[PDB]
Amino acid sequence: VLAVDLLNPSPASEARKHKLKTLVPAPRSFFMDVKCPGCFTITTVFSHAQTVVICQGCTNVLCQPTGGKARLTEGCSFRRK
Template identity: 50%
Template sequence: MKRKEILTPVPRSKFLRVQCPDCGNEQTVFSNVATRVKCNICGRDLALPTGGKSKILSDKVKEIG
């Protein structure tokens, strides 16, 4: 086989840098969360699990990786 024909699996999940709309705290979360992710400062929900990709309730700053 040619080297270009060999496919390498690439993960679809990523780490996201999100910002809390209430206090402005930036926090890193996984794109497929299994539990609720709350802000470390004020306690507001930032991401909720949905069975696949998580529902992000805050502002995404950037994707990491």
């Protein structure tokens, strides 16, 4: 307070700032890869999906939508990129 480096905020204070209020704004959502153990299929799901994402066939599920992050279903794997 009184003087601070405004071009170099700390990553920890930057990380607790709201989305639109970081120095250059940017998202905080991510993409996941999801397989369901009987299938060798790799569907890529967005973290905050509004669609009941289905794998390439097999009338299953992969996630359900919410007010925030998509709740991935049951036993499923996820790497995140």
